[PDB]
Design a binder for these strands. Sequence first.
RNA 1: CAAUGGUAGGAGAGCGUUCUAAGGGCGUUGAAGCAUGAUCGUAAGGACAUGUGGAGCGCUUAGAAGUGAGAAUGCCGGUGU
RNA 2: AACUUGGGAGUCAGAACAUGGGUGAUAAGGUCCGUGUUCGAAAGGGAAACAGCCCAGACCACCAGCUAAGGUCCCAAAAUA
RNA 3: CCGAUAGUGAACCAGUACCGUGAGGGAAAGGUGAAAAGCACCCCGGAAGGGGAGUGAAAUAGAACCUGAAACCGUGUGCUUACAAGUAGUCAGAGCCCGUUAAUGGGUGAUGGCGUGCCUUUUGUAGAAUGAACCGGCGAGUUACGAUUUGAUGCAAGGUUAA
Lengths: 48, 49, 102, 112, 154, 116, 145
Amino acid sequence: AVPKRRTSKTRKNKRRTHFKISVPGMTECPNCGEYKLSHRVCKNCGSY
Amino acid sequence: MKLHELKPAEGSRKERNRVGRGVATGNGKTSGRGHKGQKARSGGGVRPG
Amino acid sequence: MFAIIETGGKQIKVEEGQEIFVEKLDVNEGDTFTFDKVLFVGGDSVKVGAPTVEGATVTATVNKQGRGKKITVFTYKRRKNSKRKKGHRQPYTKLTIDKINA
Amino acid sequence: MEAKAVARTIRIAPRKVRLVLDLIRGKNAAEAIAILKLTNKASSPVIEKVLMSALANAEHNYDMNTDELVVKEAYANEGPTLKRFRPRAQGRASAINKRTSHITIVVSDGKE
Amino acid sequence: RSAVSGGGRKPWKQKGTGRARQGTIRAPQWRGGGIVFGPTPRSYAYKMPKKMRRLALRSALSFKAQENGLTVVDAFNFEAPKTKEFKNVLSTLEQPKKVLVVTENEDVNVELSARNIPGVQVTTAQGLNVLDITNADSLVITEAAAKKVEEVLG
Amino acid sequence: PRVKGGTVTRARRKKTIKLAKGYFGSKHTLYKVAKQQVMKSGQYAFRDRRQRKRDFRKLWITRINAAARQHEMSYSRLMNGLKKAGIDINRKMLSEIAISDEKAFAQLVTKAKDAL
Amino acid sequence: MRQTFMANESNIERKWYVIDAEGQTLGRLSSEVASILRGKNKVTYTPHVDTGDYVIVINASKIEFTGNKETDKVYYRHSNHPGGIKSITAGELRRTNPERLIENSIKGMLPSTRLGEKQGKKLFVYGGAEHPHAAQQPENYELRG
RNA sequence: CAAUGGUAGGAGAGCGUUCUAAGGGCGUUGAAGCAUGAUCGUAAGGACAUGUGGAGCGCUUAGAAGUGAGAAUGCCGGUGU
RNA sequence: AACUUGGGAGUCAGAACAUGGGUGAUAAGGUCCGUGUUCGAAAGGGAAACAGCCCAGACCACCAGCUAAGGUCCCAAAAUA
RNA sequence: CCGAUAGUGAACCAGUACCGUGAGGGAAAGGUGAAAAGCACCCCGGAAGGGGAGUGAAAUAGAACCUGAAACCGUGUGCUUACAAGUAGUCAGAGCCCGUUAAUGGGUGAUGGCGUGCCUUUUGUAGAAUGAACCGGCGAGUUACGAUUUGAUGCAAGGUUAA
Ligand SMILES: [Mg+2]
Ligand SMILES: [Mg+2]
Ligand SMILES: [Mg+2]
Ligand SMILES: [Mg+2]
């Protein structure tokens, strides 16, 4: 139950290929033109 | 003879044998003492006689 | 058209106008070296010499007598504390052919 | 041409800051700001401020107006780590490396 | 390993810990530990047979006479110490930058005069030594010192 | 006088790291493994400088054997025939004659077929 | 490193050859076909590039066998499962799926290198006089053995 | 003309590091270090050019040694997985 | 080549094959002797791979040539002699 | 004789942090510049930071401050790679980029041939025997006195001094 050997830099960088953050679901707000998250209330204006 | 060109008498001096410095010297690992036994230990050997 | 010559310990196929590399010779820069050991003159007129084709010589200008690139011989035997590093550089000659005979 | 802005010894481990910077690499200034302000991660407020400084730097020092700016390149690399310990079981102590980050952002007009 | 401060306690037990067995924090492999076989206070001087010491002074002096670097002057007669004057004596005698001046017995004024000329050492006829004759490219011996050096060394 | 081993280890290790230029992964940045791989490389090179001589020899054999059967005659008989005729041309050269000058190869094959 | 020609893909010309398997023993045809598609008959042979020709075998059901390996000469093959051994005799292949018989006898005569696979893919074995490759204009080849 | 695989091991010749004596030199018009390079010798290794660097350091001969590290579950310090 | 004298050693765990014997069970990759060889301290070719078997001792090149043991339909150089 | 892993344990408020009930044990830590000239103002920021301007020969000399290597972590990209069985090299070689300490040149490498790390210990180890995570530094036949032998050097029926 211990690592029998090192994980080389190649293996490391390989495993984390799919480890990333997604760009937010952002759309432009119709009253102010600033971006907002879709289905959420704009925090700059306060609309829909 | 000048002090900056001096030479020692031919064959009068010889560089001593440093032991335990690399394999290429021929006395590298065991320092010429074989592998094991008293001879291979520090302060080893046996009393004469 | 193409001649085959025997120099040093090997054979080379040659047509006038080419640069070649052979073992070291004893001639100097810019000189002319003529080979007398020709074994086959081919192309439009073929002459197959039994051992050698009698008469056909091959003359070439000499240039750039030099030393090959340094191959570094290294060998070791594991666990036996034994190794050897030597360096080597074969000498050679650059010859340019300028004429052929038949 | 290029405006610079750097934040040093930020108290966030560099593996964690780089996850957010892998989004604003090569995007426009407005879109980049909208990403940061809406990405719900810890490093995001601290980067939105390094970007802000660069952009201000651009306007105040080069007359490089912000409507045409793009994060030319933006990265983060390690900083002076702070070493601490956690009292674990059976008298043994394990180490905790509180890391840091040297955040860099450069925005360009794409021009010369 | 005996003269480094402290270091008397076995740093940890011999078996059980997973560490290498150690016996003192002042062993040679340890940072801050005892030195194995380094320098010790000693002298470096040796001796040679007496006759060989004499053939070496003569050989240096004979070498000097071969290279034409032996100027016998009659006397020196300096009455007060003045360095400009000894420098003059040497330049009018055309002596190289490095010269060894030999007086008969101690000549106080000749000595006080050549102490500062850079490249000149003053020696009595009995205090002649090989390292000094061999560095010097030229010699300047008083006739009385020259007869004394012939008597002593042969 | 003490002497500290600075600036002697650096160069020696660097001129092996540099000499391992282009090896996979960690074999081109660490001395302790770069040295082993360079040793092994030298050993392999020393063997291959011999192996090459025979690999190319059998390459010429295969080419000559292919060329001979276009004339309904096998390599063994071909070489035996040239030995009988007195012809001394290397396998290297015969391989090149076969590639370049078909007429000439045919002609010397006949001179060897007739040396039966 | 003086003057040995090396073939490269700018100068390799591969031709097509229909070999008929009627009345030919398996090994003595498969070995020759393997030599063909390996390219060992090209005077311009080169070990590290795929010189060599295409081969279409066409009858592939008129193969004859020496001795009585009609019932013997069972081929084995495993599915990497426990107890997953499956075997089949040569006659059953010769009547059912005879194309695989020859396509497996020849590929066993080539190396297992990548060149080996790309060379074995140059083989098209069909079990009946007609071949669907008339567009590649295949010249007939006669077995030298 | 002959010889040249080699371990315990014997013999010989050498390459390098610090310091000292002397001689002769180089250095803010840029020393030592550091980095790069496709250079030289049979090897230990030696130069050259270009960058960083901001003061010491080479060469010849000879002397002395805290003189050469890859392994000791080595010690200290950094950084990994 | 050999011997004599002197300076310096390492070695006192051997191994397998072939052959003559003991021991065991005309057992063992057993054990103890004798006599070669090899490995140890030996790379190279053959024996699929395989310290001890067969052939043969590597000073360093070469994209030259001849052979030993083993081989010549394909993998794989050579006889579908 | 040593130059900051050395030399005192201690170049620096060191027998001090610290540890132990106590005897006791016992560290780690020097270097901006010539001069503090130690960055007036402006800009983003709550601040830490930064970016200009200015000081200075130099500010990747800005106070954690001389030089600043390697492990290690990133950001670009020239060449490669998604049918392959790999002690990771060598040897043979196309294609594609580049151009030097100009020499029969540098980078990458489709595809073929050969090829089970190193040390220790052993009759024998790829060994699943042992040892090392990786980089760096430190880390082991020396000195005193006496004997013996060899080389060298005096001078020789004599040679040599010790305190
Ligand atoms: Mg507790
Ligand atoms: Mg192991
Ligand atoms: Mg394993
Ligand atoms: Mg371990």
